[PDB]
Coordinates of C-alpha atoms and ligand atoms in Angstrom, one line a residue:
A1 CA 205.5 169.5 227.4
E2 CA 205.0 166.7 224.9
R3 CA 202.1 164.2 224.8
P4 CA 202.7 161.2 227.0
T5 CA 203.4 157.9 225.2
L6 CA 200.5 155.5 224.9
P7 CA 200.7 153.1 227.8
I8 CA 201.2 149.5 226.6
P9 CA 199.6 146.8 228.8
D10 CA 202.0 143.9 229.6
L11 CA 201.3 140.8 227.4
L12 CA 201.1 138.1 230.2
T13 CA 201.7 134.4 229.5
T14 CA 201.8 131.3 231.8
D15 CA 204.5 130.3 234.3
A16 CA 205.9 126.7 234.6
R17 CA 203.0 125.8 236.8
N18 CA 200.8 127.0 234.0
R19 CA 199.4 129.9 236.1
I20 CA 198.7 133.6 235.5
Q21 CA 198.4 135.7 238.6
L22 CA 196.0 138.7 238.7
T23 CA 195.8 141.0 241.7
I24 CA 192.8 143.3 242.0
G25 CA 193.7 146.4 244.0
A26 CA 193.3 150.0 244.8
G27 CA 196.0 152.5 244.0
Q28 CA 196.4 156.0 242.7
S29 CA 196.5 157.6 239.2
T30 CA 197.1 161.2 238.1
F31 CA 194.8 162.9 235.6
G32 CA 195.6 166.5 234.5
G33 CA 197.8 166.9 237.6
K34 CA 195.3 165.8 240.2
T35 CA 195.6 162.4 242.1
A36 CA 192.6 160.1 242.1
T37 CA 192.0 156.7 243.8
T38 CA 191.8 154.1 241.0
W39 CA 191.6 150.4 240.8
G40 CA 193.6 148.0 238.6
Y41 CA 194.6 144.5 237.8
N42 CA 198.3 144.1 238.4
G43 CA 198.6 147.8 238.9
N44 CA 196.9 151.1 239.6
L45 CA 194.5 151.3 236.7
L46 CA 193.3 149.0 233.8
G47 CA 195.1 145.7 233.5
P48 CA 197.4 143.5 231.5
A49 CA 196.7 141.6 228.3
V50 CA 196.4 137.9 229.0
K51 CA 197.6 135.8 226.1
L52 CA 195.7 132.6 225.5
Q53 CA 196.1 129.9 222.8
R54 CA 193.3 127.8 221.3
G55 CA 193.4 124.3 222.6
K56 CA 195.5 125.0 225.6
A57 CA 194.3 125.3 229.2
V58 CA 195.6 127.9 231.6
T59 CA 194.9 128.5 235.3
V60 CA 194.3 132.1 236.5
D61 CA 194.8 132.9 240.2
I62 CA 192.7 135.9 241.1
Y63 CA 193.6 137.8 244.3
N64 CA 191.0 140.3 245.4
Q65 CA 192.8 143.0 247.4
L66 CA 189.9 145.4 247.4
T67 CA 187.8 145.8 250.6
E68 CA 184.6 144.9 248.7
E69 CA 183.6 141.8 246.8
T70 CA 184.1 141.5 243.1
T71 CA 183.9 139.0 240.2
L72 CA 186.0 138.6 237.1
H73 CA 184.3 138.0 233.8
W74 CA 186.1 137.2 230.5
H75 CA 184.0 139.1 228.0
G76 CA 184.0 137.3 224.6
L77 CA 185.5 134.0 225.9
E78 CA 183.4 130.9 225.4
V79 CA 183.8 129.1 228.7
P80 CA 181.5 127.1 231.1
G81 CA 179.4 129.1 233.6
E82 CA 181.5 127.9 236.5
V83 CA 184.5 130.0 235.3
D84 CA 182.5 132.8 233.4
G85 CA 182.7 135.2 236.4
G86 CA 179.2 136.6 236.2
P87 CA 177.6 138.0 239.4
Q88 CA 177.6 134.6 241.1
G89 CA 181.4 134.4 240.8
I90 CA 182.1 136.1 244.0
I91 CA 185.6 136.7 245.2
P92 CA 185.7 137.8 248.8
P93 CA 187.7 140.8 249.9
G94 CA 191.1 139.6 250.7
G95 CA 190.4 136.2 249.1
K96 CA 191.5 134.3 246.1
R97 CA 189.7 132.3 243.4
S98 CA 191.3 130.2 240.7
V99 CA 189.8 129.4 237.3
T100 CA 191.0 127.0 234.6
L101 CA 190.2 128.3 231.1
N102 CA 190.2 125.7 228.3
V103 CA 190.3 127.9 225.3
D104 CA 188.3 126.6 222.3
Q105 CA 187.5 129.4 219.9
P106 CA 189.3 131.3 217.1
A107 CA 191.8 134.0 217.5
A108 CA 190.3 137.3 218.8
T109 CA 190.7 140.2 221.1
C110 CA 188.5 139.8 224.1
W111 CA 188.6 141.6 227.5
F112 CA 187.9 141.1 231.1
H113 CA 186.2 143.2 233.8
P114 CA 184.1 143.0 237.0
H115 CA 180.6 141.7 237.1
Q116 CA 179.6 142.4 240.7
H117 CA 175.9 142.4 241.2
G118 CA 174.5 146.0 241.0
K119 CA 178.0 147.5 241.0
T120 CA 179.5 146.7 237.7
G121 CA 179.3 150.3 236.5
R122 CA 181.1 151.6 239.5
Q123 CA 183.9 149.0 239.5
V124 CA 184.6 149.5 235.8
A125 CA 184.5 153.3 236.3
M126 CA 187.1 153.0 239.1
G127 CA 189.5 151.4 236.6
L128 CA 189.1 147.7 236.3
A129 CA 189.5 146.4 232.8
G130 CA 192.0 144.1 231.1
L131 CA 192.5 142.5 227.8
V132 CA 192.6 139.0 226.4
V133 CA 194.6 138.1 223.2
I134 CA 193.6 134.7 221.9
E135 CA 195.8 133.2 219.2
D136 CA 195.3 130.0 217.2
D137 CA 197.1 128.1 214.4
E138 CA 195.6 130.1 211.6
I139 CA 196.2 133.7 212.5
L140 CA 200.0 133.6 212.7
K141 CA 200.2 132.4 209.1
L142 CA 198.7 135.7 207.9
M143 CA 201.8 137.6 209.0
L144 CA 199.8 140.6 210.3
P145 CA 201.5 143.3 212.3
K146 CA 202.5 141.5 215.5
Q147 CA 205.1 143.4 217.4
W148 CA 203.2 144.1 220.6
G149 CA 203.5 147.8 221.6
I150 CA 205.1 148.8 218.3
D151 CA 203.0 147.9 215.3
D152 CA 200.3 145.9 217.2
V153 CA 198.8 147.9 220.0
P154 CA 195.7 147.8 222.1
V155 CA 193.6 151.0 222.3
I156 CA 191.2 151.0 225.3
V157 CA 189.1 154.1 225.1
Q158 CA 187.1 155.3 228.1
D159 CA 185.5 158.4 229.4
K160 CA 185.5 159.6 233.0
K161 CA 184.5 162.6 235.0
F162 CA 186.1 163.9 238.2
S163 CA 185.0 165.9 241.1
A164 CA 186.7 169.2 242.1
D165 CA 189.0 167.3 244.5
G166 CA 190.3 165.1 241.7
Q167 CA 188.4 161.9 242.5
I168 CA 186.4 159.8 240.0
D169 CA 182.9 161.2 240.3
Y170 CA 180.7 158.1 239.8
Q171 CA 177.1 157.8 240.7
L172 CA 174.3 155.4 240.0
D173 CA 171.2 157.8 240.3
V174 CA 168.0 158.4 238.5
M175 CA 169.7 160.3 235.7
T176 CA 172.4 157.7 235.1
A177 CA 170.0 154.8 235.5
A178 CA 168.2 156.3 232.4
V179 CA 171.0 157.7 230.2
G180 CA 174.2 156.2 231.6
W181 CA 177.3 157.5 233.4
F182 CA 179.4 159.6 231.1
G183 CA 182.0 162.2 231.5
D184 CA 184.0 165.0 229.9
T185 CA 187.5 163.4 229.9
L186 CA 188.6 160.8 227.4
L187 CA 191.3 158.3 228.4
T188 CA 193.3 156.1 226.0
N189 CA 194.9 153.1 227.9
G190 CA 194.4 155.4 231.0
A191 CA 196.3 158.4 229.5
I192 CA 194.9 161.7 228.3
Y193 CA 195.7 162.2 224.6
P194 CA 198.9 160.1 224.3
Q195 CA 201.1 159.7 221.3
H196 CA 202.2 156.4 219.8
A197 CA 205.3 156.0 217.7
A198 CA 204.7 153.5 214.9
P199 CA 206.9 152.3 212.0
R200 CA 206.2 153.0 208.4
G201 CA 203.7 150.6 206.8
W202 CA 200.7 149.0 208.6
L203 CA 199.8 149.7 212.2
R204 CA 197.3 147.3 213.8
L205 CA 195.0 148.8 216.5
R206 CA 193.0 146.5 218.7
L207 CA 190.2 148.9 219.6
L208 CA 188.0 148.5 222.7
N209 CA 185.2 150.8 223.8
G210 CA 185.5 150.5 227.5
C211 CA 183.1 153.2 228.4
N212 CA 180.2 152.6 230.8
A213 CA 177.6 154.2 228.5
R214 CA 179.3 156.2 225.7
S215 CA 179.2 154.9 222.1
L216 CA 182.2 155.9 220.0
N217 CA 182.9 156.4 216.3
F218 CA 186.5 156.1 215.2
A219 CA 188.1 157.8 212.3
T220 CA 191.4 159.5 211.4
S221 CA 192.0 163.2 211.4
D222 CA 193.2 163.3 207.7
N223 CA 190.6 160.9 206.4
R224 CA 192.9 158.0 205.7
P225 CA 190.9 154.8 205.8
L226 CA 190.7 152.1 208.4
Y227 CA 190.8 148.5 207.3
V228 CA 188.7 146.4 209.6
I229 CA 190.2 142.9 210.0
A230 CA 188.4 141.5 213.1
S231 CA 185.3 142.0 215.2
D232 CA 184.5 140.8 218.8
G233 CA 184.9 137.1 218.1
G234 CA 187.7 137.1 215.6
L235 CA 188.8 137.7 212.0
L236 CA 186.5 138.8 209.3
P237 CA 186.6 136.8 206.0
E238 CA 188.5 139.7 204.3
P239 CA 189.4 143.3 205.2
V240 CA 186.6 145.8 205.1
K241 CA 187.6 149.4 204.3
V242 CA 185.8 152.1 206.2
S243 CA 186.0 155.8 206.7
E244 CA 184.5 155.7 210.1
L245 CA 183.9 152.9 212.6
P246 CA 181.1 153.0 215.2
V247 CA 181.9 151.0 218.3
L248 CA 179.4 150.2 221.0
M249 CA 180.2 149.7 224.7
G250 CA 182.1 146.5 225.2
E251 CA 182.8 145.9 221.5
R252 CA 186.2 145.3 219.9
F253 CA 187.4 145.8 216.4
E254 CA 190.9 145.3 215.0
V255 CA 191.9 147.7 212.2
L256 CA 195.0 148.3 210.1
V257 CA 195.9 151.9 209.3
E258 CA 198.7 153.1 207.0
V259 CA 201.6 155.0 208.6
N260 CA 203.6 157.3 206.2
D261 CA 206.9 159.2 207.0
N262 CA 206.5 162.8 208.0
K263 CA 202.7 162.8 208.4
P264 CA 201.5 162.4 212.0
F265 CA 197.8 162.1 212.3
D266 CA 195.3 161.5 215.1
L267 CA 192.9 158.7 215.7
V268 CA 189.6 160.5 216.6
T269 CA 186.1 159.8 217.7
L270 CA 183.3 161.6 215.9
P271 CA 180.1 162.9 217.5
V272 CA 177.5 160.2 218.0
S273 CA 173.7 160.3 217.9
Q274 CA 173.2 159.2 221.5
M275 CA 171.5 161.1 224.3
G276 CA 173.9 163.0 226.4
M277 CA 177.0 162.1 224.4
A278 CA 177.5 165.2 222.3
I279 CA 178.2 167.7 225.1
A280 CA 181.4 169.6 224.6
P281 CA 184.1 168.5 224.1
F282 CA 182.3 165.6 222.4
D283 CA 180.1 167.9 220.2
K284 CA 183.1 167.9 217.7
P285 CA 185.6 165.3 216.6
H286 CA 187.7 164.5 219.7
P287 CA 191.3 163.2 219.5
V288 CA 192.0 159.8 221.0
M289 CA 195.7 159.5 220.3
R290 CA 198.3 160.9 217.9
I291 CA 200.2 158.5 215.7
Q292 CA 203.8 159.6 215.2
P293 CA 205.5 157.9 212.2
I294 CA 209.0 156.5 212.6
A295 CA 211.1 156.0 209.4
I296 CA 211.8 152.3 210.0
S297 CA 209.9 149.8 207.8
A298 CA 207.1 147.9 209.6
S299 CA 207.0 144.2 208.5
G300 CA 203.2 143.5 208.7
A301 CA 200.9 142.6 205.9
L302 CA 197.3 143.3 205.1
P303 CA 196.2 140.1 203.4
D304 CA 193.5 139.9 200.8
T305 CA 191.8 137.0 202.6
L306 CA 191.8 136.5 206.4
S307 CA 189.6 133.5 207.3
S308 CA 186.7 131.4 206.3
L309 CA 183.3 132.5 207.6
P310 CA 180.6 129.7 207.5
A311 CA 177.3 130.4 205.8
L312 CA 174.3 131.2 208.0
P313 CA 172.3 128.0 208.4
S314 CA 168.6 127.6 207.6
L315 CA 166.4 129.4 210.2
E316 CA 163.3 127.1 209.9
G317 CA 162.9 124.9 213.0
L318 CA 165.3 126.8 215.3
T319 CA 164.0 127.7 218.8
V320 CA 163.1 131.4 219.1
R321 CA 163.6 133.2 222.4
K322 CA 162.1 136.7 222.9
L323 CA 163.9 139.2 225.0
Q324 CA 161.8 142.4 225.4
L325 CA 163.9 145.1 227.0
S326 CA 162.1 147.8 228.9
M327 CA 162.6 150.8 231.0
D328 CA 160.1 152.1 233.6
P329 CA 158.4 155.0 231.8
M330 CA 158.2 157.3 234.7
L331 CA 161.9 156.8 235.7
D332 CA 163.0 157.0 232.1
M333 CA 161.2 160.3 231.7
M334 CA 162.6 161.6 235.0
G335 CA 166.2 160.7 234.1
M336 CA 165.9 162.3 230.7
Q337 CA 164.4 165.5 232.3
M338 CA 167.3 165.7 234.7
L339 CA 169.7 165.4 231.8
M340 CA 167.9 168.2 229.9
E341 CA 167.8 170.4 233.0
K342 CA 171.5 170.0 233.6
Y343 CA 172.8 170.4 230.0
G344 CA 169.9 171.8 228.0
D345 CA 169.3 171.3 224.3
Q346 CA 172.8 170.1 223.7
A347 CA 172.0 166.8 225.5
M348 CA 169.9 165.9 222.4
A349 CA 172.3 167.3 219.7
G350 CA 172.3 165.0 216.7
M351 CA 169.2 163.1 217.6
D352 CA 166.2 162.9 215.2
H353 CA 163.7 165.8 214.9
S354 CA 160.9 163.6 216.1
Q355 CA 162.9 162.9 219.3
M356 CA 164.7 166.3 219.5
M357 CA 161.8 168.3 221.0
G358 CA 163.0 169.8 224.3
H359 CA 160.3 172.5 224.0
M360 CA 157.7 173.8 226.6
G361 CA 157.7 170.6 228.8
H362 CA 159.5 170.9 232.1
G363 CA 156.7 169.8 234.4
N364 CA 157.1 169.0 238.1
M365 CA 158.4 165.5 238.6
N366 CA 158.0 164.6 242.3
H367 CA 160.8 164.2 244.8
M368 CA 159.0 162.3 247.6
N369 CA 159.7 158.7 248.6
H370 CA 156.8 156.5 247.5
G371 CA 158.6 153.3 248.5
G372 CA 160.4 150.4 246.9
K373 CA 157.8 149.9 244.1
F374 CA 159.2 153.2 242.5
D375 CA 162.9 152.5 243.2
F376 CA 165.1 153.2 240.1
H377 CA 167.4 150.3 241.2
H378 CA 165.0 147.8 239.6
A379 CA 163.5 150.0 237.0
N380 CA 165.1 148.4 233.9
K381 CA 163.9 145.0 232.8
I382 CA 163.9 142.1 230.4
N383 CA 160.6 140.3 229.8
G384 CA 159.0 142.3 232.6
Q385 CA 161.5 141.3 235.2
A386 CA 164.4 143.2 236.8
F387 CA 167.4 140.8 237.1
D388 CA 166.9 138.1 239.7
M389 CA 170.1 136.2 240.4
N390 CA 168.2 133.4 242.1
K391 CA 165.9 132.7 239.1
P392 CA 167.4 132.0 235.6
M393 CA 164.7 132.9 233.1
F394 CA 165.2 129.8 230.9
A395 CA 167.5 126.9 230.0
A396 CA 169.0 127.3 226.5
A397 CA 169.9 124.2 224.4
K398 CA 173.5 123.1 224.3
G399 CA 175.2 122.6 220.9
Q400 CA 172.2 123.9 218.9
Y401 CA 171.6 127.1 217.1
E402 CA 168.9 129.3 218.5
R403 CA 167.4 132.6 217.2
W404 CA 167.2 135.2 219.9
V405 CA 165.0 138.3 219.2
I406 CA 165.9 141.3 221.3
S407 CA 163.6 144.3 221.3
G408 CA 164.0 147.9 222.4
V409 CA 160.7 149.0 221.1
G410 CA 159.1 151.2 223.7
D411 CA 162.0 153.5 224.4
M412 CA 164.7 155.4 222.5
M413 CA 167.8 154.5 224.6
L414 CA 170.8 152.7 223.2
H415 CA 171.2 149.1 224.4
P416 CA 174.3 147.3 223.2
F417 CA 173.0 143.8 224.0
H418 CA 175.6 141.2 225.1
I419 CA 175.2 137.4 225.6
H420 CA 177.6 135.4 227.6
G421 CA 179.0 132.0 226.6
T422 CA 178.9 132.5 222.8
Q423 CA 180.1 134.3 219.8
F424 CA 177.0 134.8 217.6
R425 CA 176.1 135.9 214.1
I426 CA 173.8 138.9 213.6
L427 CA 170.8 138.3 211.4
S428 CA 169.2 141.7 211.9
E429 CA 170.8 144.6 213.7
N430 CA 168.1 147.0 214.9
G431 CA 165.9 146.2 211.9
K432 CA 168.5 146.1 209.1
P433 CA 171.0 143.4 207.9
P434 CA 174.4 143.9 209.5
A435 CA 177.1 146.0 207.9
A436 CA 179.9 143.9 206.3
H437 CA 182.3 144.5 209.1
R438 CA 179.6 143.5 211.7
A439 CA 178.5 140.3 209.8
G440 CA 181.1 138.0 211.3
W441 CA 181.5 136.9 214.9
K442 CA 180.0 139.2 217.5
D443 CA 179.1 139.2 221.1
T444 CA 177.2 142.5 221.1
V445 CA 174.4 143.8 218.9
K446 CA 172.8 147.2 218.8
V447 CA 169.2 147.5 220.0
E448 CA 167.8 151.1 219.9
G449 CA 164.0 151.6 219.4
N450 CA 163.8 148.5 217.1
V451 CA 164.5 144.8 217.1
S452 CA 167.6 142.7 216.6
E453 CA 167.9 139.0 215.9
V454 CA 171.0 136.9 216.5
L455 CA 172.0 133.3 215.8
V456 CA 173.5 131.8 219.0
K457 CA 175.0 128.5 220.0
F458 CA 176.4 127.5 223.4
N459 CA 179.1 124.9 223.5
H460 CA 179.5 124.8 227.3
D461 CA 177.4 124.1 230.4
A462 CA 176.2 126.8 232.9
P463 CA 174.2 125.6 235.9
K464 CA 171.7 127.6 238.0
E465 CA 174.5 128.3 240.6
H466 CA 176.8 129.8 237.9
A467 CA 174.4 130.9 235.1
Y468 CA 175.2 132.8 232.0
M469 CA 174.1 136.4 231.7
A470 CA 172.4 138.2 228.8
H471 CA 172.2 142.0 229.3
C472 CA 172.5 145.5 228.0
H473 CA 176.1 146.6 228.3
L474 CA 175.2 150.2 229.1
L475 CA 176.4 149.4 232.6
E476 CA 173.9 151.6 234.5
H477 CA 171.1 149.8 232.8
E478 CA 172.6 146.4 233.6
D479 CA 173.0 147.4 237.3
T480 CA 169.4 148.6 237.5
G481 CA 167.9 145.4 236.2
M482 CA 168.4 145.0 232.4
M483 CA 169.9 141.5 232.7
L484 CA 168.7 138.0 232.8
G485 CA 170.4 134.7 233.8
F486 CA 170.1 131.5 231.7
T487 CA 171.3 128.0 232.1
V488 CA 172.8 125.5 229.5
Ligands
CU501 CU1 181.6 143.0 229.2
CU502 CU1 180.5 138.8 228.6
CU503 CU1 170.3 149.5 227.9
CU504 CU1 178.0 140.3 231.2
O505 O1 179.7 141.8 230.6

């Protein structure tokens, strides 16, 4: 039995009425021979790739065929709050909502997913995610690999776990509210360890970490380099050669990799230094997909220069906004203890010696109900407040750079922090200047026991009724309060 081929999402463009139709629905998938209920856009699992063009408007008709409410957020796309599809963007079960997207940002790979209040983790875990391919005038002149599904492929990497009966085994509980929902099965565009046949020359991979909570670190099995050409918000100024590529939850990178005749190799993910994430099989490099070379010449180029990145402006005089992330200490400690009890020392493999200590310290954490004050559902916070959909925390300026300072000092958990309505520039990532491939346009920044600072500008309105979100993209943290709303 050979490896299945890598599924290729349909690249979906507008009709004559300038409409794209997305249906959200429940179906079935098979994983290792067992059927599971799964959810998808225009299918059973995952979704299509919606193709957009800078300066053109399209209308998307969104049909919710689930039996529960949902929303549809365009992660990475700079659009008004009204069409942003945050938690206020409710689509009733059996109903339809239409949005018009007036695309005005550079070429990039973005994505889309649910943003249902308190339930985003579950709805993503059930299968909802799709892709957005934005093109502009500039990018096509570069003559990059561009044959969709051949030498230009999306690679959506996600973990899941399943119960004995085959169903997706998702829970938002005290453990997952602390450390995230993660599993033992890695999916690549919904398939387990697929192969992709690619022509000789350059192969472009549009990588998305679509995991709820698991950070990833891409590399190749034979140590051939990856050439990073794009981050969340578009092209870098020039390619950046790397041996390994860390990718946080919700982040995208586009890379070129060389394909040579007769030498198959795997894309792999390397063990990460994140609590819970190095349990077998993830204690060792884990294959993501095999690349099978085809002896046909691939036409794409790796240009010396890709785009022009503007200089960072002067910081003096810019509004500063503080966003202090926090976790309830008691519930954080409880969740961590549950993780250690379940998996043992391995749940801290690869962490620092200071943190590591899982020594004599398994004291009795109580199991009685002490009321809503101690409910994990609102344990995670920004500026001392669990997300309140009725109360945006502030109004940001429109068309002005601001400096946002996001702190995770006070706990050791990983918080990939995401801000709607913008592509920003990272000034400091967790207390260090950003790596070259992370110095361009980003919509996510790492916050882990330290402080990050980003330079952000909002070009579109967001009223109180359809506010922008800023949140941790570890989805179980978001769902248990680590989110705020803001207006523009
Ligand atoms: Cu997102
Ligand atoms: Cu977003
Ligand atoms: Cu977090
Ligand atoms: Cu969001
Ligand atoms: O998001």
